[PDB]
Amino acid sequence: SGGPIKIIDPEKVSKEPDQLIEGFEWTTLDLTNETELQELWDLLTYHYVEDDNAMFRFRYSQSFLHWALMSPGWRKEWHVGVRATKSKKLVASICGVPTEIRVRDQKLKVTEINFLCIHKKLRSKRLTPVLIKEITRRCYLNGIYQAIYTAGVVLPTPVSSCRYYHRPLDWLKLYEVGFSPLPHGSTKARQITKNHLPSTTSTPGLRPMEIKDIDAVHDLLERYLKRFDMNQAFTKEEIEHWLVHKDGAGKEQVVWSYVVEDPETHKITDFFSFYNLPSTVIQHPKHKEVRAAYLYYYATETAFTEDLKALKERLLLLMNDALIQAKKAHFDVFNALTLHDNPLFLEQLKFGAGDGQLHFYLYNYRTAPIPGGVNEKNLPDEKKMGGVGVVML
Template identity: 50%
Template sequence: MLSRLFQRGLPKLGGGPSMMGLVQARFNSSSASVQAAPFSTTTSEQDKPKRTRRKKQRRVMKDGPHNTGLHQLCSLSPELSKIVGASKASRVDINKKLWGYIKSHNLQEESDKRNIKPDAVLGKHTYSSSILDGLIESMSSSDNKATVESKEEPKSQDSEQFETPASSTPAEPVDDVAHEQAEIKDLLDKMHIAPAAPPKAHKFWNTQPVPQLGPVPEDARGPIDEPKKVSDIPKEPYNLPAAFEWSNIDVNDPEQIQEVYTLLNENYVEDDEAMFRFDYSPEFLRWALTPPHYVPEWHFGVRVKSNGKLVGFITGIPATMDIRGDELRTVEINFLCVHKKLRSKRLAPVLIKEVTRRVNLTDRWQAVYTSGAILPRPITTARYHHRSLNPKKLCEVGFTRLAPRMTMARCIKLYKVADHPTTSGLRPMEMKDRKQVTKLLNEYLSKFKAHPILSQHEVGHWLLPRENVIQTYVSYWEMVREENGKVTDFLSFYSLPSSVLGNDKHKTLYAAYSYYNVANTVSLKQLMSDALVLAKQEGYDVFNALNLMDNNEFLEDLKFGRGDGDLQYYLYNWKCPFMEPQDMGLVLL
């Protein structure tokens, strides 16, 4: 899973079959039969079910009831057989009856507890493979029991033929209903359906001033924690285990930034298959951590006392945010990392509490951060989308794969971009563009419910081009004199490569990430099409973008593929109702 890394998704090659379809396949292949099913008779070759057209994708009985998986399942319970025993019933109809019965007899809570999630109307189901094993085992034991009973108490052909239909059965007394409920519960037990996993406990976050999971009023706003003063904040750092010590990190020192790079490169975000790992370069880290007015004490870590090795790290940078009309002096928290071998030491909560203490000492009480995990409580959830620029390499490293009936030649042609940008006057941003770009950006961001408020110095830091770090291009119109030129549009993307693990041919995957883009005289689609061209020219393999702000205007048309994971946005110590990703105007690195 790469939701923690690229948020990318491999193509899905069709969904899995329903449980009943799998049960039928298992029983058809094993030639098992139930000899004493209360609704079945000996079937001839003519009575066997026939497939309808493939387009219908279901099995319908011609003359009599099923003698396959679902009906063998019902042989475990005479009451269930009455529900599904009608002839010429499709699996969809039978499923609707079966699950409708569970709901009407107040067994919904029981089925929910056991993680049964059928969509009865469409006949689609979500089940684990352990259910099938339980069904096979249960039905096999039932088959043996049924065979013995049929030998002891054989039924005459006449009694089979004139058995009272289920539709004419009189109303059942309360005792019978209770008996049926017990039968269903017993059936669920036999299916070995495990109860749904309880919600994950957040022992640390439940003690912090963050919105807890659950609905939030639309007008919620303001701090969560009781107002404090700087004088209330402890001046001494939190205690660490005896073997560790706090250490401030100077990101401008080559040796110290190299230590940070090594820690992140070996222990930071990695996909579950251990195929890719973020590769933050020292130059990128310096850019990300040294904006105007940054506080050096907010960059610190944990070292081992005995050898001085850096084993934990966390950072904060100052930022001004507008949250639904409230202007807040906040801090952006990033790069929380603990060495893999020490994650049982509970260092991460101590790092978070320590950075909170240090930030509070500067009279800042709110923070913003992101995570791939669901914590209490996101203010929005965004999804990464990916545009292939080098399909051949992406397939070779396992980032994606060819769709069925797609050749590599056709794939390369499909994702080919233009040779040159189409927007007039497009050139790299320069220092003289700062004032105009700042005005354009702040005006654009002001329409979103949550967004940063940036000064000229901050815009210059974040957007002026840096090789292999950040690229910004402006559409610049020359006037009579050069100093009177006008910036009308701009695009930007930053570079975040990933190490390719265990691949002999490729060692690095070069990824460009959409940053801030403002389109006034051209469409956003055209502007981002030019961004793809520029990224391709600079050697990137893939272009990534979140569905934030107005990005949905170009994602589909420019052939971005939807990733398979979410990125959660969080606020610390501020009430805020959930918002759509299109209302979020902040991009965190």
């Protein structure tokens, strides 16, 4: 089951950060300041993807960054930066939001770390342990003794590893920008036919999530997520932040959520959500961006009957509707990982395997490795689920 690596006494934790390497200094980011938001945005756009031939890169936005970093309980002090002393330019960042997860039946207050970014010029200084140590020192002073973070590379011991999958929605666009390949002997018509979607949804009672649904989604999601070895815990205030889009001036929609109201009993029996994070096409004559949806949290009452056949059929129904709703909202591609129960539907719904991997890390906590939905060949396998029930951004 595991437990903490060290029990920490918050009165013995240093109140001042560690001295940095020669010419650099700590900073606290004020992301309500658009100039500082711009600094982080610029650092992330050019330095957050670890590989240097990436001819794609994520396009962040004020709405996305506010959604990711300003969740209930957020503090400026957990938006940490490093600046070069001479120029004051921002050269590294690590941001955390406080929440709770469960790890093999044990509930833990954590900081979920979501933009650990190091400028290309400082990768040789190996600052990752140094940033993690500093944000967690700040969390230790507030009674949070564990963290969870991710990476696209293997570092000393992921707790789990998941594979990225991609479902084209506008295959032709994806082909034109070099995102999707044309398989040998195939044709545009063949691939367009392959990825065709109905124009209407099939799940009876399906429709968009609303404020009144918060209590019911909270209960259902919590019951579903508790089934996984490592899973996110939600308060009702977190459900509303993370899942309910709020329309407002200067505000762009980041998350889409739908529920299924059973036509007879009128209870919420299913729900799913997805978020927008576009990828910039580094130069192309016709297309600037890939509008990408990422599958987020979902849940279904069918899970609790414990027969895999019925759960597969229900997820095939629900997630094909998720694809239809994304296509209706003009997304080009629908991305998902092998976590949750996703291997039950990825291949059938024509998600193609990606070369990306997401690796999960726990800080100050020891537990047995957790299955990530894939077998030893890195292929989805229903015997390797039940492990990862946290979606990190």
